[PDB]
Amino acid sequence: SDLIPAPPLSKVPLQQNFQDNQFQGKWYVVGLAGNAILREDKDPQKMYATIYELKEDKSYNVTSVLFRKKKCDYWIRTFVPGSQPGEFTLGNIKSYPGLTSYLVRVVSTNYNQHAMVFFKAVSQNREYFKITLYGRTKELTSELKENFIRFSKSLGLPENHIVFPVPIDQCIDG
Ligand SMILES: O=C(N[C@H]1COC(=O)[C@@H](NC(=O)c2cccc(O)c2O)COC(=O)[C@@H](NC(=O)c2cccc(O)c2O)COC1=O)c1cccc(O)c1O
Ligand SMILES: [Fe+3]
Numbered sequence: 418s419d420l421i422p423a424p425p426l427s428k429v430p431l432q433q434n435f436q437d438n439q440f441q442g443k444w445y446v447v448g449l450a451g452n453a454i455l456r457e458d459k460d461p462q463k464m465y466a467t468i469y470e471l472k473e474d475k476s477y478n479v480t481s482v483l484f485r486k487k488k489c490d491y492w493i494r495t496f497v498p499g500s501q502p503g504e505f506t507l508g509n510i511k512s513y514p515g516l517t518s519y520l521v522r523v524v525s526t527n528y529n530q531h532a533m534v535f536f537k538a539v540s541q542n543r544e545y546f547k548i549t550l551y552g553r554t555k556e557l558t559s560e561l562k563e564n565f566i567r568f569s570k571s572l573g574l575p576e577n578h579i580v581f582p583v584p585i586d587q588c589i590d591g
């Protein structure tokens with residue numbers, strides 16, 4: 418298994434004055450880029466949603482919902498606030514076989530339309546990283562998508578490591 422190296426954290430900006438309350442709610446994964454992400458023309462990635470909800474202790478309950486095998490899988494996890502506002506770590510890391518590290522960093526967002534979030538996970542000693550282009554609606558402007566392509570490339574990812582999930586109506590609505 419050969420992976421493109423995770424970028425130095427210096428090359429990943431941080432959203433200034435992060436408003437955790439405003440980042441709550443459903444986001445659509447309109448763009449996906451990473452060293453473990455591949456473009457598949459035979460079976461193109463279907464769009465999925467990720468809901469963020471602040472608890473009393475100000476950690477997130479991050480629930481992903483995707484359409485797979487004719488059903489709807491619910492992938493739940495907790496983001497604990499990290500070193501800075503916008504940065505998070507994965508709660509209950511011990512419950513994931515092999516996972517020794519997990520970082521999340523909100524690169525940029527306007528809270529009501531779009532967001533770019535940088536993730537980085539060390540599982541089985543393999544360093545994985547990804548950037549998701551969150552959209553409040555299923556569609557986003559060409560500028561925002563080209564900006565996401567530009568940023569992904571600045572972290573060493575080529576074109577075939579950047580996919581744009583196709584919009585669907587199954588389960589990501591509601
Ligand atoms: O590129 C990343 N993974 C690869 C796979 O590589 C990994 O990092 C492994 N897995 C975790 O380490 C992980 C442990 C505990 C919690 C995790 O979220 C883990 O990812 C393998 O399993 C998976 O995560 C599987 N995928 C989901 O379950 C998923 C489905 C929908 C939505 C998802 O978010 C999913 O993870 C297989 O596909 C992947 O997405 C990747 C990198 C950096 C940060 C990531 O979060 C990545 O996911
Ligand atoms: Fe993941």
Ligand code: NA
């Ligand atoms: Na993924």
